[PDB]
Design a protein around this ligand. Structure first.
Ligand SMILES: *[C@@H]1O[C@H](CO)[C@@H](O[C@@H]2O[C@H](CO)[C@@H](O)[C@H](O)[C@H]2NC(C)=O)[C@H](O)[C@H]1NC(C)=O
Ligand SMILES: *[C@@H]1O[C@H](CO)[C@@H](O)[C@H](O)[C@H]1NC(C)=O
Ligand SMILES: *[C@@H]1O[C@H](CO)[C@@H](O)[C@H](O)[C@H]1NC(C)=O
Ligand SMILES: *[C@@H]1O[C@H](CO)[C@@H](O)[C@H](O)[C@H]1NC(C)=O
Ligand SMILES: *[C@@H]1O[C@H](CO)[C@@H](O)[C@H](O)[C@H]1NC(C)=O
Length: 283
């Protein structure tokens, strides 16, 4: 509220333990952040580079638990950017053209407190100029040091990813919720969901998936506790779709299953998958 201790260009609430420095075209993280802060919003700025120790203060921001840097024109997050935030549970870097994400951005040097990481729409425009894998860069940051052991929720929508990163599933043992919506995934064939006991939610909407084959159906058929989201994929309703349609009619795993429709072939375009039978599915 008015009069609460606050940096210039920010609005603060001591009662809510909240600092908001939003849509202010800031170029650097404010230096005199109040030590009470639990929730810090620094969205809509022009930060460019997040250096090591960008939030490290003396005394530290020991209560800072939620940090939102979405939409702030960050193009580089350096090694150790989030060091000396011992309570940090939720971090949002979405809608930043992150051309340079250090592998040690989340792990620092030398296990992270992070429980939720939101990295939607981080792929820079015209990233193909780079001679490095963007998805690989992000994966390396996720796995470095095995620092992200407590991570329970990961969002990686809208990043032009071409494949489901298998190492993320194998090496983040606490993950409960994974969002890979609005990417360009084409199949799940070489991905194993067999031992993913903790995974409660998997978002694959708006990808380029053609069909799920029996192998994947089998492994999902054996995860009772998952919710999978498959909306707006360009399903190909030919004879290879037969297993998936059979499964879809029986399963409780797929959320919103009534919305799934064929994109191809032409004679099946826009037909609802749950309504199809063996006679519709021919090669
Ligand atoms: C981080 O800050 C952004 C910007 O305020 C929040 O963005 C909004 O998110 C909702 C869905 O959660 C959208 O429907 C709005 O359109 C978003 N606005 C913008 C400008 O992107 C975002 O929710 C915040 N995230 C958290 C976890 O605090
Ligand atoms: C931030 O920058 C943009 C373009 O430079 C401008 O339109 C906008 O008014 C600025 N924001 C504020 C709060 O002045
Ligand atoms: C979906 O992904 C595309 C391309 O990566 C992006 O341009 C578009 O903004 C994304 N959609 C949303 C709703 O963010
Ligand atoms: C789950 O299986 C994969 C691939 O077979 C393996 O790499 C991973 O370590 C297993 N997970 C656990 C927690 O042991
Ligand atoms: C796939 O698995 C199901 C399980 O009921 C089975 O009935 C079906 O014939 C199998 N299809 C294959 C291997 O194409």
């Amino acid at each position: 509220e008015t009069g609460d201790q606050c940096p210039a260009l920010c609005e603060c609430s001591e009662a809510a333990r909240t600092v908001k420095c939003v849509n202010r075209n800031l170029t650097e993280v404010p230096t005199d952040l109040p030590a009470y802060v639990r929730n810090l919003f620094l969205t809509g700025n022009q930060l460019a580079v997040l250096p090591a120790g960008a939030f490290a203060r003396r005394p530290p921001l020991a209560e800072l638990a939620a940090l939102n840097l979405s939409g702030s024109r960050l193009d580089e997050v350096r090694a150790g950017a989030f060091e000396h935030l011992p309570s940090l549970r939720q971090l949002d870097l979405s809608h930043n053209p992150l051309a340079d994400l250090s592998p040690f951005a989340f792990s620092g040097s030398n296990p992270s407190p992070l429980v939720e990481l939101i990295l939607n729409h981080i792929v820079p425009p015209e990233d193909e100029r780079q001679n490095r894998s963007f998805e690989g860069m992000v994966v390396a940051a996720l796995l470095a040091g095995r620092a992200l052991q407590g991570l329970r929720r990961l969002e990686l929508a809208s990043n032009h990813f071409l494949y489901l990163p298998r190492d993320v599933l194998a090496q983040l043992p606490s993950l409960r919720h994974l969002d890979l919506s609005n990417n360009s995934l084409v199949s799940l064939t070489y991905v194993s969901f067999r031992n993913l006991t903790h995974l409660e939610s998997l978002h694959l909407e708006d990808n380029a998936l053609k069909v799920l084959h029996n192998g994947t159906l089998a492994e999902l058929q054996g995860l009772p506790h998952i919710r999978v989201f498959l909306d707006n994929n360009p399903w190909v309703c030919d004879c290879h779709m037969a297993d998936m349609v059979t499964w879809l009619k029986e399963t409780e795993v797929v959320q919103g299953k009534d919305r799934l429709t064929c994109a191809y072939p032409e004679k099946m375009r826009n037909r609802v998958l749950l309504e199809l039978n063996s006679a519709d599915l021919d090669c």
